[PDB]
Design a protein around this ligand. Sequence first.
Ligand SMILES: CN[C@@H]1CCc2c(ccc(O)c2O)[C@H]1O
Lengths: 331, 52, 287, 231
Amino acid sequence: QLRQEAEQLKNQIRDARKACADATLSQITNNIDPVGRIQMRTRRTLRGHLAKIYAMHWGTDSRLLVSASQDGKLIIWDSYTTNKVHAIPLRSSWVMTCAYAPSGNYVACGGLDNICSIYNLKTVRVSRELAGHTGYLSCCRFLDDNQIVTSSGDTTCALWDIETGQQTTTFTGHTGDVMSLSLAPDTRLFVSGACDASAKLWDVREGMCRQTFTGHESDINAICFFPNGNAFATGSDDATCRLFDLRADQELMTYSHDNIICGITSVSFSKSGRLLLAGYDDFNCNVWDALKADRAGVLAGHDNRVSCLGVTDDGMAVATGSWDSFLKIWN
Amino acid sequence: QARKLVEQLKMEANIDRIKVSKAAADLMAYCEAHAKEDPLLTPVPASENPFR
Amino acid sequence: EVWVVGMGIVMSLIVLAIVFGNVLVITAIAKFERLQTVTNYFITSLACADLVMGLAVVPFGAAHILTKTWTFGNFWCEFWTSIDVLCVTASIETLCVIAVDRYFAITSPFKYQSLLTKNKARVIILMVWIVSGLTSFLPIQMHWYRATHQEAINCYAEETCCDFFTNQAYAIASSIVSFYVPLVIMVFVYSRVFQEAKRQLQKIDKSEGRFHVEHKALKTLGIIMGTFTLCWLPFFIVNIVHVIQDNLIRKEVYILLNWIGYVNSGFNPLIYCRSPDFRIAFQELLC
Amino acid sequence: QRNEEKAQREANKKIEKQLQKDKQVYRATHRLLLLGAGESGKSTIVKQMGIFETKFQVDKVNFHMFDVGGQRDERRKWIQCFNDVTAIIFVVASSSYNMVNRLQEALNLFKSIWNNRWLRTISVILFLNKQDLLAEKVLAGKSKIEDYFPEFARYTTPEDATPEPGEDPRVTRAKYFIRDEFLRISTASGDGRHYCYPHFTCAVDTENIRRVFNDCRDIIQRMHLRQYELL
Ligand SMILES: CN[C@@H]1CCc2c(ccc(O)c2O)[C@H]1O
């Protein structure tokens, strides 16, 4: 019935992508000089978390960051003076995500409990308990002071309205368990990597998926747009990181090595997009040169697997939050 | 439920694409243009470094 | 002389081994945050005691033995003796504290987290060091350990000869505080630990007998207690005896057994720092 | 000026004091994961003693059990969140060997949990619930265990066992085979880091809390005895 039509459409899409794949990113960037070796040292170590950490998010100003740990505590640090500005308790100990609003006044927090919690920093109580998801909530990001997009265990990603506490729109049509998402710099598009090999692209205003990418061969644990907003890199469990492109749907470059076999938990880009910092299960991060797919450095010093990663808006510092209860800010 | 899947595939298949050469050129040009303002690409002076 | 040089080489090797092992374990504990644990504070207290031993008393004692005379002042003789007693007492008491910590962790697992904390571990180490100081410095610097017989008073008057002469009361009290009481505590706690290990092995054999699922426990307890006992018990028995009997023990035998006790400081990191975490830390630091 | 720095230092000190106060409680409590198949007796066990949290205290020890309903799926990506729990309580209905096999699905789930990379140290407490229904099924000739499980024909009762004061030999063989399948799965991939504690429980028992307490005590004792080169 419709299966033949679906197969024909998939074949047509593959043929079109192959037709648009005349060259390769490696060939064009071959003539460029290598980035060289980058050495990073732990400028600041943040301590005070009782157990493992799953998420962190930098503020609009690079001073403040919020980290989520399974302690039931949501601590907001001051990166410059390594001081704990706030330590928010949690109703549920199990937490898998956190977010720091661009306004700097709101913080999101969700975990195995389907509810997403929004906290008011300037007033520290739960402003709204966004409910309506079915599976475990995976990621949160703030479109604005009033709109937040969440991705949960079920196949659906939802866009919420904080003032009304209701799902303005729901992005469905996926197969696996959605794990991570990243917003565009213009806050008009976002993507979502999941346990399914696909990593779809969604339109916030229309609410319908636009493009899908299936380069990977395993579950996707992390995703992040290029600073240009025209590309993104996904971290899978196949020990590979791939750079996709929105204009040309086919995957451009792949980041992998024979020595590493562990999966990727968190990825992030540098301010210029040259370095693709990626967290691994080998208790250390790897700095990948985006244009050449050649490793540029190693971020070692974590006693357990790295589960969080972020680069400041100014691009000055990079912080990794591992299952080791200690944050580590590099430079 | 296959009707929704085939409709979505048809909707997303009819989009305009550019060659990988153009996208790679744009990415390389952006990386080269914004390379100076990257504090991680090249170490910043200790005076300009906040964490130090 | 050929014989004199050989003893010098052996004592230099002993000093090097003690210093190297102790600095290795101390820097492994200090540098790495994953190696900082409530038991590791006792481990590093023992390591510090052994390090100050191997830095202060082993080399000066070696020079005293080789030269057959004390070139330093009488105050320096008293200071060296006090540091020797302090190091021995601190090391043995810290070993006993480690044994007690293991006993509490195994026998009472639910309450083990409550009894010992990071703040509560500091007090125990401070208590051990204060006890060792009160045992060593007070009866020596205040001149309470001085014997009364003619040889002792003649040796003490001379500033060039530095030998140990002690009273009945101080020798007995120092031995009881340093070795015999910790020996009894170790024996009790390790017997309880062995009983618990054998009981758990019996339970495992009951649950998974047909499937393939106490040699190891016996080997570990032997390497932990036999090395500690064989190093120090022979010294302390003659330490009691030469005071009980004025002619039973010769000075050469006394010093030989004292140095056999000394080498336990070097042997300690081998016995106690053998977990895979310590192995990885040592491999990273040395290479 | 320095007023902001002083205020930030005071706030940090207050937060650190509160964190230590909460850390005392956190280290004084034990977290357990109740993970079993549906209708297998999880509700009965919860009643006896998105996410359901049940806290019970025995012998002045705080136990915090967590049962997750979630979405019925085999991926179980959330299972990595429970890599630091004291134990995993597995409740399985041993009387469902013939129903649709449910017992084979439970065995597959137990094998998946046992061999999980993150759960390479967490011991599993196994509850073989619905014992009375299994006895009733075994006594009746309607269903034969050997038909559903071919290995039952060659199976023989253990030479050393603990039969009940009033128990039939046939139901004894059935119960011991059901236990032995899980025990074999546990032993094949075991490395001494984590063990499996099987228990023949019933809906009418009242000491299951004592059994869980004893199993947790044994788990922590064995962990401590293995940290040092003992056991
Ligand atoms: C000079 N050598 C001293 C003399 C007596 C003595 C030692 C060690 C521990 C003690 O408790 C002692 O009483 C020996 O190391």
